[PDB]
Amino acid sequence: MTLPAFKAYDIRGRVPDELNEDLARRIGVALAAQLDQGPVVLGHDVRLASPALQEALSAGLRASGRDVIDIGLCGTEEVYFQTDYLKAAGGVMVTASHNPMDYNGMKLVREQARPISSDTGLFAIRDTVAADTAAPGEPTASEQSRTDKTAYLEHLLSYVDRSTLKPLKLVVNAGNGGAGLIVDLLAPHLPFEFVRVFHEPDGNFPNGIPNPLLPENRDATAKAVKDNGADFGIAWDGDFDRCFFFDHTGRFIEGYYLVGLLAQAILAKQPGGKVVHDPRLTWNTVEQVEEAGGIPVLCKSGHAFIKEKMRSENAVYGGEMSAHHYFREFAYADSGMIPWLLIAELVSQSGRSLADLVEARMQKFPCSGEINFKVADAKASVARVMEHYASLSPELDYTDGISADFGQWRFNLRSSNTEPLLRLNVETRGDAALLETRTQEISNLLRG
Numbered sequence: 001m002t003l004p005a006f007k008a009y010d011i012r013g014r015v016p017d018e019l020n021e022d023l024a025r026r027i028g029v030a031l032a033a034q035l036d037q038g039p040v041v042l043g044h045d046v047r048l049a050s051p052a053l054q055e056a057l058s059a060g061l062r063a064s065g066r067d068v069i070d071i072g073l074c075g076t077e078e079v080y081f082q083t084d085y086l087k088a089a090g091g092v093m094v095t096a097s098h099n100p101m102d103y104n105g106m107k108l109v110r111e112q113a114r115p116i117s118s119d120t121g122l123f124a125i126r127d128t129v130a131a132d133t134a135a136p137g138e139p140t141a142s143e144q145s146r147t148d149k150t151a152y153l154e155h156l157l158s159y160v161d162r163s164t165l166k167p168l169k170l171v172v173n174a175g176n177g178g179a180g181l182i183v184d185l186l187a188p189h190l191p192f193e194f195v196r197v198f199h200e201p202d203g204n205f206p207n208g209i210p211n212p213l214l215p216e217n218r219d220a221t222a223k224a225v226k227d228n229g230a231d232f233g234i235a236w237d238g239d240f241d242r243c244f245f246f247d248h249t250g251r252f253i254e255g256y257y258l259v260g261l262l263a264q265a266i267l268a269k270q271p272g273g274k275v276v277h278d279p280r281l282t283w284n285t286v287e288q289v290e291e292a293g294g295i296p297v298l299c300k301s302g303h304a305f306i307k308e309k310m311r312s313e314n315a316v317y318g319g320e321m322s323a324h325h326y327f328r329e330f331a332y333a334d335s336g337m338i339p340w341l342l343i344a345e346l347v348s349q350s351g352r353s354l355a356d357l358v359e360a361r362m363q364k365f366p367c368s369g370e371i372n373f374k375v376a377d378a379k380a381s382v383a384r385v386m387e388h389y390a391s392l393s394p395e396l397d398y399t400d401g402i403s404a405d406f407g408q409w410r411f412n413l414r415s416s417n418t419e420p421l422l423r424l425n426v427e428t429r430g431d432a433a434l435l436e437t438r439t440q441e442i443s444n445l446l447r448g
């Protein structure tokens with residue numbers, strides 16, 4: 001067969017049968033052969049086994065004559081930032097995201113933190129690793145420890161006018177991942193009053209593997225917001241490239257609405273800019289981008305397509321409904337830190353609560369949320385949906401699965417690139433009843 005750990009966008013698998021130190025070293029050797037010349041940035045998340053996988057990557061890279069820049073325990077976005085900032089040949093973040101305790105993984109980038117994906121080098125690496133029976137060579141290059149986060153912290157703070165910030169009370173919930181380190185380094189430079197929840201990094205995860213989308217994890221942030229009268233709450237995944245917002249009522253804000261909100265925030269600083277968005281949920285983003293004087297650019301979902309489209313368009317910002325936010329000035333990469341700084345600035349400057357900033361948009365373009373379906377036959381299931389609606393003559397778009405626009409409602413139906421599932425998103429023009437009846441109708445067809 002083929003090594004299962006090599007996925008479309010990254011490497012992820014159970015340790016040690018799908019990923020281990022020998023494979024990690026071989027990945028380092030193979031990666032050295034794929035990159036242009038220069039050093040390689042390495043960082044890792046809070047999982048207990050991550051440092052040893054990084055050390056194995058480093059051994060293989062250095063056996064292949066690559067200098068290694070070890071940035072230590074960090075967020076994924078720090079690997080992206082430092083790879084670009086230091087003009088490195090590439091970078092690897094060792095991260096397990098929210099996979100089980102016996103799992104780990106890696107995200108790989110080349111120059112300017114450009115993604116390395118299945119069809120842009122990752123399967124080439126896999127094939128090299130798979131055939132590699134060579135004896136491990138000894139190091140012919142050095143490793144440097146780079147602990148300095150100054151340039152990264154200065155870059156994050158450059159997105160806001162600090163003199164306009166108000167002393168908002170913010171709940172912050174690292175979920176025992178790595179986000180609290182950066183919050184604490186930012187805090188001396190900000191006026192906010194932080195309420196720290198699950199703040200200490202702990203790869204044993206006494207409060208569960210970080211995943212703010214799980215209701216029991218979500219509720220911990222909501223409770224802290226309500227009990228402390230916080231202006232809003234922020235939670236992160238473990239490697240903090242995803243962030244999640246809770247308004248002052250404790251309500252979790254569906255990620256779709258953050259795309260339009262962040263776009264308006266960014267367009268106030270970069271007028272007339274292009275904003276890239278995914279095709280799952282669109283109407284609100286298109287309107288909000290245009291209303292702020294920007295130009296919306298539809299793009300297939302997935303960070304590699306988004307980043308490539310942003311580059312070719314000089315787009316200032318790109319956002320996916322699933323809590324991924326990309327910034328041109330940040331090497332076109334995603335950050336879980338930039339978004340909450342921008343939102344804190346917008347609440348501070350506008351005098352409006354986060355709730356008020358989104359309320360009317362949520363009423364105007366209500367959405368189903370992404371609903372996933374494991375079915376026996378995805379192709380036959382999609383066909384059942386399309387045949388059912390053919391007599392309504394929707395406008396069809398195939399940018400990413402099938403998007404069907406009926407006028408007052410639309411849907412997107414996609415096969416995932418990360419799981420063998422069908423994913424449904426429905427939205428309507430201000431009509432909650434139509435949203436529910438159409439969502440349920442499609443659901444019944446998919447399950448038939």
Ligand SMILES: O=P([O-])(O)O[C@H]1O[C@H](COP(=O)(O)O)[C@@H](O)[C@H](O)[C@H]1O
Pocket residue numbers: 009301302303304320322324415416417418419423
């Ligand atoms: O989930 P992550 O953080 O690994 O993120 C990855 O998978 C997501 C879901 O993709 P799909 O809907 O095809 O399953 C993508 O939107 C995202 O751009 C990609 O980086």
Ligand SMILES: [Ca+2]
Pocket residue numbers: 076097237238239240241242
């Ligand atoms: Ca993540």
